[PDB]
Design a protein around this ligand. Sequence first.
Ligand code: UD2
Ligand code: UD2
Ligand code: MN
Ligand code: MN
Lengths: 253, 255
Amino acid sequence: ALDSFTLIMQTYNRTDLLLRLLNHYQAVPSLHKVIVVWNNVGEKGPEELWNSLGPHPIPVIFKPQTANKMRNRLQVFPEVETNAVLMVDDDTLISAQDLVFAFSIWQQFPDQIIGFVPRKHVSTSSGIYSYGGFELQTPGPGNGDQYSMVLIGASFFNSKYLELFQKQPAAVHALIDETQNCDDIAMNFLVTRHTGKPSGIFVKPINMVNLEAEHFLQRSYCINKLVNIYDGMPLKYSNIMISQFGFPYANHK
Amino acid sequence: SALDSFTLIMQTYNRTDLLLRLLNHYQAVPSLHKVIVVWNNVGEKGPEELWNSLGPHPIPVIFKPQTANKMRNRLQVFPEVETNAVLMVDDDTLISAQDLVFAFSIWQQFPDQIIGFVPRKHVSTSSGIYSYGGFELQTPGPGNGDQYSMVLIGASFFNSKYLELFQKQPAAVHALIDETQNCDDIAMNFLVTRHTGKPSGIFVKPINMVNLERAEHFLQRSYCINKLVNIYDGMPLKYSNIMISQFGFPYANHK
Ligand SMILES: CC(=O)N[C@H]1[C@@H](OP(=O)(O)OP(=O)(O)OC[C@H]2O[C@@H](n3ccc(=O)[nH]c3=O)[C@H](O)[C@@H]2O)O[C@H](CO)[C@H](O)[C@@H]1O
Ligand SMILES: CC(=O)N[C@H]1[C@@H](OP(=O)(O)OP(=O)(O)OC[C@H]2O[C@@H](n3ccc(=O)[nH]c3=O)[C@H](O)[C@@H]2O)O[C@H](CO)[C@H](O)[C@@H]1O
Ligand SMILES: [Mn+2]
Ligand SMILES: [Mn+2]
């Protein structure tokens, strides 16, 4: 359980992908256990099929959920024995090389969200914010760009943030259920408020693949709602992009 | 102010023309508070008169003649240094302002580490015996990728407090540097990591750094790692594979 991480994968109507990803993730080094947050209410889980195809390198725990809520993966599962949690959406395949490297980065910054997907907030009207990525102008600073959030759907973060998440104002939880979105924005708000540092650090992935409209609109909406509830914009910008020295070979020159 | 600023310390020798050209560049870099030219040309008159004739300049440039031509002269505690951060650059290297502004921002976040553009390492193929090298040498690290255990001070940012700490090092250290007239950077890395318990430096990949420039040089460095290991009774250097780049600079370099 020491120097190991736990994979928390929430799944919904993607069982075929889930099983394929599981076949990949079970073999990643330093993986201690897998927790599948089964959000398909009233549907039999593929655990029988999974075991019939055993043995497997680590225990995979299927936890049936009473409702299909985005926040289910953020609960404090008793089965999690590690200090770090690896949270990945059930449609994303991240290479073992990216995971091993990112995990080693997390161990050096255990209080920050270490991930592969950076995003930001911008403002063009006092007190009004917008959610976006590199298609939006850099917020403030000089050259280059900035990110103020690292999405939890492809990251490593301290398991203690799951508990701290549960302890956030009811207005925050209310907001999450309301939109069935923005849980990662909430997590980023929560982390930076706890540390006083940028909520996360962006590690550029070498091999991460996705296997496959009011969504983005809700994103901006949530940032503004959260600013009201917390009575302030706590997110901090960063332009730190970490890559692995020598991987690929000679990438330093 | 001096807080959100850094001081350039450039040691020069038989490269006065080069020094001057480099000075024209560095003087215009943002957040530069002052420049200290460690003049190692014993017996020759400094270009200070020529410098002032071509003024005005953005910052004060202090020329400090040295009694002897020693590599460690740039590691002294100059009273004129008013910043917490020192920018040390050899007099043959031109680091772009963009690299410097970015690297300085990284240093501000890791004030106790050497933030630099030139990463190197030590390796050991025989129990207890070390060797100096770069990416042409096998990774000493666990798995894939490579590792670096040192960031050369000749193109880096580091805490000025380390100059004072260096003066307090065992005489054997100062002796070794004077002996080889090399290894000051290796001595600095030993010092920093022994002090922080963390890797001595953090590698920041440069976007635009250019060099405008004895085989014993390399051989001496390996010698110094072992000599230093004896002086300190151990190998304190810690490996790291963290390579930092600026998000979005160049544009879309995140994809
Ligand atoms: C990398 C990234 O940008 N991922 C985020 C984004 O993904 P997307 O908007 O791309 O949505 P998605 O379909 O990839 O779902 C993300 C995760 O939530 C699960 N899911 C989805 C729909 C549903 O009704 N029930 C359910 O449990 C799903 O199995 C997956 O693990 O927006 C979501 C909010 O909606 C979450 O913040 C995701 O982490
Ligand atoms: C990028 C890099 O690896 N730089 C280091 C390396 O440069 P090099 O070995 O490339 O040597 P170099 O000729 O560039 O000299 C480095 C610096 O030392 C100064 N100098 C040199 C010779 C002399 O007799 N007096 C004098 O003061 C010179 O002005 C310059 O600022 O080795 C040196 C030790 O020898 C120093 O550790 C340099 O920081
Ligand atoms: Mn998706
Ligand atoms: Mn040189």
